[PDB]
């Protein structure tokens, strides 16, 4: 048989990200002396649109504590931050929207974005437009800080991990209907060649597990096991349940 579509993507020829116009990589500052003993001041020189990205970016320039020079970082714009604002970054730093603080140093209920998984990875969690994490407690011995991630998951990370106070700008973007193919076209045009999607049930069997038949149908259960092998996994991979989710969601 043929090699099915989801298998071709890993080679990354026509499926690599459409990257030319991107502003750069959004990252917290390097976790240097200033940030983990005191705090450092910067000015958001500009907040700007990143192509293919939901949320606007915030260009925030600092002084270099070791050489006479300006060094600029690329933050994700937390909603409310503006051109000309002073951003503070450090262990001892005020709990104001836009500043970046180690998770250990904010009370419970704090709402932060771009938070680090391990301390120093310059921003892992809560980056897409409209997302955030909430701190739900602390364990001062071992200095963990229990947080809740946008999925609902409740991970526990180091209290040294850094997050930026507030939520990420550009929320509600997904409440507007795309309304027509072209909008989705220009959407994925600046992300990657994932659109449009021929259904595996409209191809011949060479092409897909779902292919063929004199009527258009899946033919066997579309729930595929985790242990399935490449070229088998298409449909509902490892589905622990299926069907229209009725009743209240919201993890207990």
């Amino acid at each position: 048989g043929r090699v099915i579509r989801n298998q071709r993507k890993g080679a990354g020829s026509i499926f690599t990200s459409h990257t030319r116009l991107r502003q750069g990589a959004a990252k917290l500052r390097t976790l240097d002396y200033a940030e983990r003993h005191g705090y450092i001041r910067g000015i958001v020189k500009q907040i700007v649109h990143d192509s293919g990205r939901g949320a606007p970016l915030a260009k925030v320039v600092f002084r270099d504590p070791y050489k006479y020079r300006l060094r600029e970082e690329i933050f994700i714009a937390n909603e409310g931050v503006h051109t000309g604002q002073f951003i503070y970054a450090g262990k001892k730093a005020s709990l104001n929207v836009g500043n970046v603080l180690p998770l250990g140093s904010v009370p419970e209920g704090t709402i932060v974005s771009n938070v680090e998984e391990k301390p120093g990875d310059r921003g892992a969690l809560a980056r897409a437009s409209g997302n955030y994490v909430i701190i739900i407690g602390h364990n001062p011995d071992e200095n963990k800080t229990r947080v809740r991630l946008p999925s609902g998951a409740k991970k526990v990370i180091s209290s040294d991990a850094r997050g930026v106070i507030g939520v990420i700008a550009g929320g509600g973007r997904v409440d507007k209907p795309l309304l027509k193919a072209g909008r989705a076209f220009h959407k994925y045009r600046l992300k990657r060649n994932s659109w449009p999607k021929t259904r595996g049930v409209a191809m011949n069997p060479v092409d897909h597990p779902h292919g063929g038949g004199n009527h258009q149908h899946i033919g066997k259960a579309s729930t595929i096991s985790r242990g399935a092998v490449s070229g088998q996994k298409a449909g509902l991979i490892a589905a622990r349940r299926t069907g229209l989710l009725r009743g209240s969601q919201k993890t207990q």
Binding site: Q46, I47, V48, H49, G54, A55, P56, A58, A77, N78, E79, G80, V81, H82, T83, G84, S94, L95, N96, V97, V106, P107, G109, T110, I111, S129, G130, Y132, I165, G166, V167, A169, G170, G171, G172, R173, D175, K176, P177, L179, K180
Partner: protein, 91 residues
């Protein structure tokens, strides 16, 4: 003279895409093209471009906001719940 009975700005799509989709768009589209009051300079010159980004005509300030409206209700309460928590660390 009143030109259209309900479609308003949404009349450009005409009959296509279904009344309800058009209705939802018309809301956010009206939300997103509008002129807003500027916090800094007290004029109503904030307008959007590039969802998330809101800059003021004069006074040249640019604020990060919601995708089709300046302030989003979420970030609004987050402002206050941070205001509340902050005050717990001085008094």
């Amino acid at each position: 003279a009143k030109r259209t009975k309900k479609v308003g700005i949404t009349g450009k799509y005409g009959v296509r895409y279904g009344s309800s989709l058009r209705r939802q768009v018309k809301k956010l589209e009206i939300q997103q093209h509008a002129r807003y009051d500027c916090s800094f300079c007290g004029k109503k010159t904030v307008k959007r471009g590039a969802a998330g980004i809101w800059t003021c005509s004069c006074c040249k300030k640019t604020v990060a906001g919601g995708a089709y409206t300046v302030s989003t209700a979420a970030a609004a309460t987050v402002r206050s719940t941070i205001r509340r928590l902050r005050e717990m660390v001085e008094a």
